[PDB]
């Protein structure tokens, strides 16, 4: 079967495009086939619903590693982001949403999602995440009141 069953370090993304993928994309875009298709202008414009929602309601999962900044004055805190982001994306994110403007450099490094087996032995892999190591001018730390 064309289903890739390997969940290791060398998992490959299949470049072949299937008909079901296009069908699902179109259906989530404009409710195919019940609703009439929007014109090409609105489809290719910045007002098309997916791009409009991604621009007015951005969805980016930024997770801070507790060990990197917990009870230690660190100058290089690390974060986990989606793979579709970049250094400029992350620095703009931290500057506009959380207000962290003093960002010296972001060290990018991809990482395969965490894999594990449950009690019955099924191989379930967590979603992929990109590791970023942001550098600040001043060392930061969040103390843990013991």
């Amino acid at each position: 079967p064309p289903v890739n069953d390997y969940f290791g370090r060398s998992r490959i993304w299949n470049p072949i495009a299937c008909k079901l993928g296009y069908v699902r994309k179109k259906a989530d875009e404009w409710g195919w086939p019940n609703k009439p298709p929007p014109p090409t202008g609105l489809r290719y414009s910045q007002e098309f619903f997916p791009f409009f929602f991604e621009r007015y309601f951005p969805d980016a999962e930024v997770r801070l590693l507790l060990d990197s900044v917990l009870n230690n004055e660190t100058k290089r805190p690390v974060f986990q982001i989606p793979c579709s982001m970049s250094k400029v994306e992350l620095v703009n994110y931290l500057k506009n949403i959380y207000g962290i403007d003093n960002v010296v450099r972001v060290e990018v490094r991809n990482r395969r999602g965490r894999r594990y087996k449950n009690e019955v032995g099924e191989i379930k892999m967590m979603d992929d995440y990109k590791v970023a190591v942001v550098e600040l001018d001043t060392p930061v730390s969040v103390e843990l009141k013991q």
């Binding site: 087996k117 009690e119 019955v120 032995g121």
Partner: protein
């Protein structure tokens, strides 16, 4: 076009050579077998999991320790009374009836009281007719005392915790009967021939007594038990603690004399005959008349009459070498290094010598 399977379970079932992999590597060394541990997961995690509120409210509905002690003592007395008496034949020793129904009530009594009682000791005191009578009388006295005046050890622990959050009177009748029955069980265990167990029982039996005479008697008994168990250090310790309690003991008690005897015998077993003679001399100057001291002094003098004829004294580097009593032989039979099996040359001990711990 062939596949390689290093070590796979056979047709009948997985053996130890594969369970070792299952426990260390995490799965079988072939990889074709999927790790499936649902059964042990259910046996361990699903069982030990308890919600926080129920865990916190559990401590509110624990059973009453006084009622538990009363019921356990009642049931144990009923069981030891129902236990039959051994019929003595003539020509062959009759096998004593095994204590099958006695382990559960005795175990409940032990876990309620905080002390351990030997099954061998219980069997021996039940076989012995007079010891059985002493044990039954002491157990009935303890039952009556814990039913009428509560539990003196529990009240003492409660007062101790109270004074810790915010003296010690003499021993009560319940604790007296308890240490009496424990000494009876220890005597039966010594008659059966388990000296280490007898010493371990008396070590906790001493905790219930607080009067100096009872403490001196328990110290003398522990000294004798450790002497028979070949733990000369503890034997000497208890033997001299007896003489330390001597100034506060009644004049009619000879527990301090027995402690002197045990200390002198421990010194003699340690091969310090001069120290043993000095100890027995002090004991005689204290109690001019005592058979336990006089017999030991005569034995030590009979040995010292021949001591200077062989080496003029006992050596210094050869002390505590000759194994005299068979208890240490019986213990070394189990705790000894085997020939090629378990020794300094076997790797399971060589690595323990190499690594720190």
């Amino acid at each position: 076009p062939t596949l390689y399977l290093y070590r796979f379970p056979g047709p009948h079932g997985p053996g130890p050579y594969t369970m070792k992999y299952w426990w260390t590597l995490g799965c079988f060394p072939t990889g074709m077998e999927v790790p499936f541990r649902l059964h042990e997961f259910l046996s361990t995690y699903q069982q030990e999991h308890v919600p926080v509120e129920v865990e916190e409210w559990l401590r509110c509905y624990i059973k009453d320790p006084l009622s538990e002690l009363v019921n356990a003592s009642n049931d144990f007395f009923k069981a030891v009374e129902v236990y039959p008496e051994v019929e003595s034949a003539r020509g062959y020793k009759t096998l004593q009836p095994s204590i099958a129904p006695l382990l559960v009530p005795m175990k409940k009594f032990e876990e309620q009281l905080g002390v351990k009682i030997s099954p061998v000791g219980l069997r021996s005191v039940l076989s012995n007719p007079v010891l059985k009578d002493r044990f039954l009388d002491d157990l009935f006295d303890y039952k009556s005392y814990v039913e009428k005046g509560g539990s003196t050890p529990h009240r003492r622990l409660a007062r101790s915790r109270f004074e810790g959050s915010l003296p010690a009177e003499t021993t009560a009748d319940d604790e007296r009967s308890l240490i009496l029955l424990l000494t009876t069980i220890s005597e039966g265990c010594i008659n059966a021939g388990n000296y280490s167990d007898a010493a371990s029982v008396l070590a906790d039996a001493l905790m219930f007594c607080h009067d100096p005479d009872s403490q001196a008697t328990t110290h003398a008994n522990i000294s004798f038990a450790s002497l028979l168990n070949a733990d000369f250090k503890g034997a000497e310790y208890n033997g001299r603690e007896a003489a330390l309690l001597q100034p506060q003991v009644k004049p009619t008690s000879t527990a301090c004399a027995r402690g002197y005897v045990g200390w002198a015998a421990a010194a003699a077993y340690q091969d310090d005959f001069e120290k043993a003679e000095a100890i027995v001399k002090d004991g005689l100057t204290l109690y001019v008349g005592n058979e336990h001291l006089e017999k030991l002094a005569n034995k030590l003098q009979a040995l010292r009459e021949e001591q200077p004829s062989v080496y003029k004294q006992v050596p210094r580097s050869l002390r505590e070498s000759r194994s005299h009593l068979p208890s240490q032989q019986s213990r070394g039979l189990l705790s000894g290094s085997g020939k090629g099996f378990s020794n300094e040359f076997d790797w399971v001990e060589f690595k323990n010598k190499l690594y720190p711990s």
